Coordinates of C-alpha atoms and ligand atoms in Angstrom, one line a residue:
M1 CA -7.9 -21.3 29.8
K2 CA -10.1 -20.1 32.5
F3 CA -7.4 -17.6 34.0
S4 CA -4.4 -15.4 33.1
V5 CA -2.7 -14.3 36.4
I6 CA -0.8 -10.8 35.4
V7 CA 2.1 -9.8 37.2
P8 CA 4.1 -6.7 36.8
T9 CA 7.6 -7.0 38.0
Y10 CA 10.4 -4.6 38.8
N11 CA 13.6 -5.6 40.7
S12 CA 11.7 -8.2 42.5
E13 CA 14.3 -10.7 42.8
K14 CA 14.2 -10.9 46.8
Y15 CA 10.4 -11.7 47.0
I16 CA 9.1 -12.9 43.7
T17 CA 9.4 -16.7 44.6
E18 CA 6.7 -16.3 47.2
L19 CA 4.4 -15.3 44.4
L20 CA 5.7 -17.9 42.0
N21 CA 5.4 -20.7 44.7
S22 CA 2.0 -19.9 45.5
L23 CA 0.8 -19.9 41.8
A24 CA 2.9 -23.1 41.4
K25 CA 0.9 -24.4 44.5
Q26 CA -2.6 -23.8 43.1
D27 CA -4.9 -26.8 43.6
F28 CA -5.9 -26.2 39.8
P29 CA -5.1 -27.7 36.6
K30 CA -2.0 -26.3 35.1
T31 CA -3.8 -26.5 31.6
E32 CA -6.4 -23.9 32.8
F33 CA -4.3 -21.2 33.6
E34 CA -1.2 -19.1 32.3
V35 CA 1.1 -16.7 34.3
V36 CA 1.8 -13.6 32.2
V37 CA 4.8 -11.6 33.7
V38 CA 5.9 -8.3 32.3
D39 CA 9.0 -6.9 33.8
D40 CA 9.6 -3.2 33.8
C41 CA 13.1 -3.3 32.7
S42 CA 14.7 -4.7 36.1
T43 CA 18.3 -4.4 36.8
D44 CA 18.6 -7.5 38.9
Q45 CA 18.0 -11.2 38.4
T46 CA 14.2 -11.2 38.4
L47 CA 13.6 -12.7 34.9
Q48 CA 16.1 -15.5 35.7
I49 CA 14.2 -16.4 38.9
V50 CA 10.9 -16.3 37.1
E51 CA 12.4 -18.7 34.3
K52 CA 13.0 -21.5 37.0
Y53 CA 9.1 -21.8 37.0
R54 CA 8.5 -22.4 33.2
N55 CA 7.9 -25.9 33.6
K56 CA 5.7 -25.7 36.8
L57 CA 3.5 -23.0 35.1
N58 CA 2.5 -21.8 31.9
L59 CA 4.5 -18.8 31.5
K60 CA 4.6 -16.0 29.3
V61 CA 7.6 -13.7 30.1
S62 CA 8.1 -10.2 28.6
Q63 CA 10.3 -7.3 29.4
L64 CA 9.9 -3.5 28.5
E65 CA 12.8 -1.7 26.5
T66 CA 12.8 1.0 29.5
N67 CA 11.6 1.4 32.9
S68 CA 7.9 2.8 32.7
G69 CA 8.0 3.8 36.4
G70 CA 4.9 2.0 37.2
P71 CA 2.6 -1.1 37.0
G72 CA 0.2 0.6 34.4
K73 CA 2.2 -0.3 31.1
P74 CA 3.4 -3.4 32.4
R75 CA 0.0 -4.7 33.1
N76 CA -1.5 -3.2 29.9
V77 CA 1.1 -5.3 27.8
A78 CA 0.2 -8.3 29.8
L79 CA -3.4 -7.9 29.4
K80 CA -3.1 -7.6 25.5
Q81 CA -1.4 -11.1 25.9
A82 CA -3.7 -12.7 28.2
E83 CA -5.9 -15.7 26.6
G84 CA -7.6 -16.5 29.8
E85 CA -11.5 -16.2 30.1
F86 CA -10.8 -14.4 33.3
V87 CA -7.6 -12.3 34.5
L88 CA -6.4 -11.8 37.9
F89 CA -3.6 -9.0 38.7
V90 CA -1.3 -10.1 41.5
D91 CA 1.6 -7.8 42.2
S92 CA 5.2 -9.1 42.4
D93 CA 5.5 -8.8 46.3
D94 CA 2.2 -10.3 47.1
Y95 CA 0.7 -14.0 47.1
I96 CA -2.4 -15.7 47.0
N97 CA -4.2 -18.7 48.6
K98 CA -3.7 -22.3 47.1
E99 CA -7.6 -22.7 46.6
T100 CA -8.1 -19.2 45.0
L101 CA -8.5 -20.3 41.3
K102 CA -10.4 -23.3 42.3
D103 CA -12.7 -21.6 44.5
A104 CA -13.1 -18.5 42.2
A105 CA -13.7 -20.9 39.1
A106 CA -16.7 -22.7 41.0
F107 CA -18.2 -19.5 42.0
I108 CA -18.0 -18.1 38.5
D109 CA -19.6 -21.3 37.0
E110 CA -22.3 -20.9 39.7
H111 CA -22.8 -17.1 39.3
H112 CA -21.5 -15.9 35.9
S113 CA -19.7 -12.9 37.6
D114 CA -18.2 -10.1 35.4
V115 CA -16.0 -8.8 38.3
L116 CA -15.2 -10.8 41.3
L117 CA -13.7 -9.3 44.4
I118 CA -11.9 -11.9 46.4
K119 CA -11.1 -11.4 50.2
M120 CA -7.8 -9.8 51.1
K121 CA -5.4 -10.2 54.0
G122 CA -2.7 -8.0 55.2
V123 CA 0.6 -9.4 56.2
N124 CA 3.7 -7.6 57.7
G125 CA 1.5 -4.8 59.2
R126 CA -0.2 -4.0 55.7
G127 CA -3.8 -3.4 55.4
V128 CA -6.2 -4.1 53.2
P129 CA -9.7 -3.0 53.1
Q130 CA -12.2 -5.1 55.0
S131 CA -16.0 -3.6 54.9
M132 CA -16.8 -5.2 51.6
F133 CA -15.5 -8.6 52.8
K134 CA -17.6 -9.5 55.7
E135 CA -19.9 -11.7 53.6
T136 CA -19.9 -13.7 50.3
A137 CA -22.5 -12.1 47.8
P138 CA -23.3 -13.4 44.3
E139 CA -24.4 -9.9 43.2
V140 CA -23.6 -6.5 44.6
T141 CA -24.0 -3.0 43.2
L142 CA -22.2 0.4 43.5
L143 CA -24.9 1.5 45.9
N144 CA -25.9 -1.6 48.1
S145 CA -22.2 -2.5 49.0
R146 CA -18.9 -1.1 50.0
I147 CA -16.9 -2.1 46.7
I148 CA -16.3 1.6 45.8
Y149 CA -13.9 1.5 48.9
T150 CA -11.7 -0.9 47.1
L151 CA -10.5 0.1 43.6
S152 CA -7.1 -1.8 43.5
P153 CA -6.9 -4.3 40.6
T154 CA -6.1 -7.3 42.8
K155 CA -9.5 -8.6 41.6
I156 CA -10.8 -11.1 39.0
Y157 CA -12.1 -9.5 35.7
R158 CA -13.9 -11.1 32.8
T159 CA -11.3 -10.6 30.1
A160 CA -13.9 -9.7 27.6
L161 CA -15.3 -7.2 30.0
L162 CA -12.0 -5.3 29.8
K163 CA -11.5 -5.7 26.1
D164 CA -14.6 -5.2 24.5
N165 CA -15.1 -1.9 26.6
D166 CA -11.4 -0.7 26.0
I167 CA -10.7 -0.8 29.6
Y168 CA -7.1 -0.4 30.2
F169 CA -4.7 1.4 32.8
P170 CA -4.1 4.8 32.0
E171 CA -0.1 4.9 31.1
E172 CA 0.6 8.4 31.1
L173 CA -1.0 9.3 34.5
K174 CA 1.2 7.6 37.2
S175 CA -0.9 8.2 40.2
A176 CA -4.1 6.4 41.4
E177 CA -4.3 4.6 37.6
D178 CA -5.9 1.7 39.0
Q179 CA -8.9 3.6 40.4
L180 CA -10.3 4.7 36.9
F181 CA -9.4 1.0 35.6
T182 CA -11.8 -0.6 38.5
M183 CA -14.2 2.1 38.4
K184 CA -14.7 1.6 34.6
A185 CA -15.0 -2.3 35.2
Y186 CA -17.5 -1.7 38.0
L187 CA -19.5 0.5 35.8
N188 CA -19.6 -1.7 32.6
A189 CA -20.1 -5.0 34.6
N190 CA -23.5 -6.6 34.3
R191 CA -22.6 -8.6 37.7
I192 CA -20.2 -7.8 40.3
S193 CA -19.8 -10.5 43.1
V194 CA -17.8 -10.8 46.3
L195 CA -16.2 -14.0 47.5
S196 CA -15.0 -13.7 51.1
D197 CA -15.0 -17.5 52.2
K198 CA -11.3 -17.4 53.2
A199 CA -8.2 -15.0 52.8
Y200 CA -7.5 -15.4 49.0
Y201 CA -5.2 -12.3 48.5
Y202 CA -2.2 -11.7 50.7
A203 CA -0.9 -8.1 50.4
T204 CA 2.6 -7.2 51.4
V205 CA 5.6 14.6 43.1
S206 CA 2.8 16.7 41.8
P207 CA -0.9 16.1 41.9
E208 CA -1.9 17.2 38.2
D209 CA -2.0 13.5 37.2
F210 CA -3.8 12.5 40.4
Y211 CA -6.7 14.9 39.8
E212 CA -7.0 14.3 36.1
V213 CA -7.5 10.7 37.0
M214 CA -10.2 11.6 39.6
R215 CA -11.9 13.8 36.8
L216 CA -11.9 11.0 34.3
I217 CA -13.7 9.0 37.2
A218 CA -16.4 11.7 37.5
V219 CA -17.0 11.9 33.9
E220 CA -17.0 8.0 33.7
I221 CA -19.5 7.9 36.4
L222 CA -21.8 10.7 34.8
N223 CA -21.7 8.8 31.5
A224 CA -22.4 5.4 32.3
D225 CA -25.5 3.4 31.4
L226 CA -27.3 3.8 34.7
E227 CA -30.2 5.8 36.2
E228 CA -29.5 9.4 36.6
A229 CA -30.3 9.6 40.3
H230 CA -27.9 6.4 40.6
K231 CA -25.1 8.1 38.9
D232 CA -25.4 11.2 41.2
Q233 CA -25.5 8.7 44.4
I234 CA -22.4 6.8 43.0
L235 CA -20.6 10.0 42.5
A236 CA -21.6 11.3 45.8
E237 CA -20.1 8.1 47.5
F238 CA -16.9 8.2 45.5
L239 CA -16.6 11.9 46.9
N240 CA -17.3 10.9 50.4
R241 CA -14.4 8.5 50.3
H242 CA -12.1 10.5 48.4
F243 CA -12.3 13.6 50.7
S244 CA -12.1 11.2 53.9
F245 CA -9.3 9.3 53.0
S246 CA -7.3 10.2 50.0
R247 CA -4.2 12.8 49.9
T248 CA -7.0 15.4 49.3
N249 CA -7.9 15.0 53.0
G250 CA -6.2 17.9 54.9
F251 CA -3.9 18.8 52.0
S252 CA -4.3 22.6 52.9
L253 CA -2.6 21.8 56.3
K254 CA 0.0 19.4 55.1
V255 CA 1.2 21.0 51.7
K256 CA 3.7 23.6 51.4
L257 CA 1.7 26.9 51.2
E258 CA 3.7 27.9 48.0
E259 CA 2.5 24.6 46.3
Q260 CA -1.2 24.7 47.5
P261 CA -2.4 27.0 44.5
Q262 CA -1.3 24.3 42.1
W263 CA -3.3 21.8 44.3
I264 CA -6.6 23.8 44.4
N265 CA -6.3 24.3 40.7
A266 CA -6.1 20.6 40.0
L267 CA -8.5 19.6 42.7
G268 CA -11.1 22.4 41.3
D269 CA -10.9 21.1 37.6
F270 CA -12.0 17.6 39.3
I271 CA -14.6 19.1 41.2
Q272 CA -15.8 21.3 38.4
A273 CA -16.8 18.2 36.6
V274 CA -19.0 17.2 39.5
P275 CA -22.6 19.1 39.1
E276 CA -23.5 21.2 42.1
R277 CA -26.8 19.2 42.6
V278 CA -24.5 16.5 43.9
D279 CA -23.1 18.4 46.9
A280 CA -26.5 17.8 48.7
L281 CA -25.8 14.1 48.5
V282 CA -22.5 14.3 50.0
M283 CA -21.7 14.3 53.8
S284 CA -22.5 17.6 55.0
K285 CA -19.1 18.6 56.4
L286 CA -17.7 18.1 52.6
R287 CA -20.1 20.8 51.2
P288 CA -17.9 23.8 52.1
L289 CA -14.9 22.2 50.5
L290 CA -16.7 21.3 47.3
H291 CA -17.9 24.9 47.3
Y292 CA -14.3 26.3 47.5
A293 CA -12.7 24.0 45.3
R294 CA -14.9 24.7 42.4
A295 CA -14.2 28.4 42.9
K296 CA -10.5 27.6 43.1
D297 CA -10.3 29.5 46.5
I298 CA -7.3 28.3 48.5
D299 CA -7.5 30.9 51.3
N300 CA -11.2 30.0 52.2
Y301 CA -10.5 26.3 51.7
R302 CA -7.7 26.3 54.1
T303 CA -9.8 28.3 56.7
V304 CA -12.5 25.5 56.5
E305 CA -9.9 22.8 57.2
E306 CA -8.2 24.7 59.7
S307 CA -11.6 25.6 61.4
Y308 CA -12.5 21.9 61.5
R309 CA -9.3 21.0 62.9
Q310 CA -9.2 23.5 65.7
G311 CA -13.1 23.9 66.5
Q312 CA -12.9 27.8 65.7
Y313 CA -15.5 29.1 63.4
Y314 CA -16.0 32.7 62.4
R315 CA -19.6 32.5 62.9
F316 CA -21.7 29.7 63.8
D317 CA -25.0 28.6 65.6
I318 CA -26.4 24.9 66.4
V319 CA -29.7 23.6 65.2
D320 CA -30.6 20.0 66.5
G321 CA -27.2 19.0 66.7
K322 CA -25.9 20.2 63.4
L323 CA -23.9 23.6 62.8
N324 CA -24.8 26.5 60.5
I325 CA -21.2 27.9 60.0
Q326 CA -20.0 31.0 58.2
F327 CA -16.2 30.4 57.6
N328 CA -15.1 34.0 57.0
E329 CA -16.4 37.4 56.8
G330 CA -18.6 37.9 53.6
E331 CA -18.7 34.4 52.9
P332 CA -21.9 32.3 52.4
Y333 CA -23.4 30.3 55.4
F334 CA -23.2 26.5 55.2
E335 CA -26.1 24.7 56.8
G336 CA -26.9 21.5 58.6
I337 CA -23.2 20.5 59.0
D338 CA -22.5 17.6 61.4
Ligands
LIG1 O1 8.5 0.8 37.9 C1 7.8 0.1 38.2 C2 7.7 -0.1 39.7 C3 6.7 -1.2 40.2 N1 6.5 -1.9 39.3 C4 5.5 -3.1 39.9 O2 4.2 -2.6 39.9 C5 3.6 -3.1 41.0 C6 3.6 -2.1 42.3 O3 3.6 -2.7 43.4 P1 4.5 -2.5 44.7 O4 4.5 -3.6 45.5 O5 5.9 -1.7 44.5 O6 3.6 -1.0 45.2 P2 3.1 -1.3 46.8 O7 3.2 -2.3 47.4 O8 3.8 -0.1 47.5 O9 1.7 -0.9 46.8 C7 4.5 -4.3 41.6 O10 4.2 -5.5 41.2 C8 6.0 -3.9 41.1 O11 6.8 -5.0 40.6 C9 6.6 -1.8 38.0 O12 5.7 -2.5 37.3 N2 7.1 -0.9 37.6
LIG2 MN1 3.1 -4.4 46.6

């Protein structure tokens, strides 16, 4: 079997037939894929709808004893059951192009990808990263492409890549768990490919867990079997994206003041796993934020964010278009900030 399509469900009764129909409609031999549904203890008739398809599909159907609260444990249970040469995770409210498995199979037989990104399309207003799907590419890296900007598991992974390297979703960390999963796949993959010929994938609490995942990602990058300068650059790119687009961006302007110490402490533990030499590699505006996160100093961290957002700085000059900023009295100057 080429493929195991892995589907975590939870009270998906109103929309699961869209996914199930798109899998039944695959222009691909039924003998060469299975559909692995693990249900997160739904209280509706999800399982009964799923059963209607057991003749159109090779279907494995499981259900957890109690709701795990997220797709991590369901997907892990399915991954242990998968016998496909490759796995594809599709969420219960999404669906795929009828030629997805056929095209992916042909691309894999031509290029032997270990991780294969497949172009996504947002429906009903949803987006959907795009900057890495402008072209089809048989081989990309973390440094010459934009793959680090999509870490959802809505991708194709060589089953043996995951299992031989013990790559599973963290079950006890309910936030951003797929970022660690896909980062680990990327870092262990001998070949990462991007297939963009058509739209294939149609897409529809405290921060302790969140920043533990981020810290595990930092440790994972730094420990990979890659050149040292390349690890540092990869970590810098991950930090660029994380501070620009994650919940970290602007948290000191949005989070209740009483809760920001808890944020800065958990963020600080993440950034403290980033060696300081890496700060020189990150976008300059983020350097004061890395500095005050490591020191776990929320007052100065918040002044930086507030200064950026209102254009006021305690002391600054401009040298060839870039600012040298002292954000508060007695604090270090940060130089060359765009
Ligand atoms: O307790 C839960 C809740 C969600 N899900 C599944 O995990 C995936 C999370 O997807 P969802 O579409 O709800 O997230 P979103 O679209 O908001 O990103 C879906 O396949 C759900 O069926 C789950 O397995 N357990
Ligand atoms: Mn969804």
